[PDB]
Ligand binder design. Sequence first.
Ligand SMILES: CCCCCCCCCCCCCCCC(=O)N[C@@H](CO)C[C@@H](O)c1ccccc1
Length: 236
Amino acid sequence: GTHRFVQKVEEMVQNHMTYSLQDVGGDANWQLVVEEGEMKVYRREVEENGIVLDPLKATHAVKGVTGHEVCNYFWNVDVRNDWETTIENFHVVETLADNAIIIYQTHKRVWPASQRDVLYLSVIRKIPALTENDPETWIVCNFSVDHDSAPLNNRCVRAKINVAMICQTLVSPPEGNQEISRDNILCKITYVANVNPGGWAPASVLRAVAKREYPKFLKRFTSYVQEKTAGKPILF
Ligand SMILES: CCCCCCCCCCCCCCCC(=O)N[C@@H](CO)C[C@@H](O)c1ccccc1
């Protein structure tokens, strides 16, 4: 629409559609560090000046939910505290459009160092399929920005993020007179997180925290979407 971040939003969605959906399984610069069920979590080891930046990428397949649903739930701030366990406080700093907000939040200490806070634009978008033979893609991008009404917090260190949750609904209609049900749909999810913790910590500790907290978030967040949509009509 007409807001000042539409160009940046476009570039991010684009970067993510081209570079983030890419296959990471046989990629030797990624290591698969967590596997649970349909979930796989990868990281690539990266540091710049002693600071761990490790790109992370998780794939998941979740039964009975659509991509539209998973992204709605991921994006929607009124349900955040139902699933998010790492947040201390947050608030919407601005509304840019009906699908784009800027959020400030403070995180619980996940290592014994200063709390980190973050200031990011969170946008939800549908990428149209090219044919009706492919899935439409829903994506939430969360990436850092600056705002007059949210400068640096004396106590907290400022993390910078570039995150995306990308989902696609696979449908598999039954052969007979039955109506399509939640049994017939599967959500493919790619979640990517590139975080700059904003200062130093021992790499072993930050890496053990990523390994612990990302899979805990995915399991709990996806399970939550499954619970909140069970029995309801399907939103594609
Ligand atoms: C960014 C601050 C780093 C220090 C706090 C967290 C350190 C690793 C914990 C990772 C937390 C996993 C759950 C994240 C779920 C998650 O994606 N949460 C979003 C909504 O609260 C913001 C999000 O797009 C994000 C992603 C990564 C880090 C911060 C915020």
